[PDB]
């Protein structure tokens, strides 16, 4: 969670996001647990 927060921040910083427009983070695993394989697919379903 430290690493993932860091890397997205650095993506947003390098590409010159307007100061005060944060990306909003959804953490689906809190409700669904870690389906280690199917992780991204549920996050995919959620995003859509």
């Amino acid at each position: 969670d430290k690493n993932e927060s860091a890397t997205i921040n650095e993506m947003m910083k390098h590409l010159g996001r307007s100061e005060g427009n944060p990306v909003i983070g959804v953490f689906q695993k809190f409700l669904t647990g870690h389906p280690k394989g199917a992780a991204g697919a549920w996050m995919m379903n959620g995003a859509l």
């Binding site: 669904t32 647990g33 870690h34 389906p35």
Partner: protein, 97 residues
């Protein structure tokens, strides 16, 4: 699988000869090939079944129970079944869920 009750076995050594039990010819020979000197097998004349005297110095596995510490998981709800969606029984038993 009850995570409070985990089946596990220990390799132990027989101190004193066991009491005979019954098994098929095939089954007995499988013991003899394993243990060799540390087991004896005999035709029981009437049945044609074999006695198994496991002897001193033989190797055994005795079950035991680890008390494990991760008791919770995100689990597909109770009563979920491939039957209800339309999958047939021949397919279910053949295949990993």
């Amino acid at each position: 699988y009850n995570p409070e009750k985990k089946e596990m076995i220990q390799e132990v050594i027989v101190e004193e000869d066991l009491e005979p039990f019954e098994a098929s010819k095939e089954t007995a020979e499988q013991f003899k090939h394993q243990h060799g000197d540390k087991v004896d097998i005999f035709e029981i004349p009437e049945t044609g079944e074999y006695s198994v005297k496991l002897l001193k110095g033989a190797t055994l596995y005795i079950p035991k129970a680890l008390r494990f510490d991760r008791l919770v998981a995100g689990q597909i709800p109770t009563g979920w079944n491939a039957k209800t969606y339309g999958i047939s029984d021949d397919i279910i038993s053949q295949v990993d869920p």
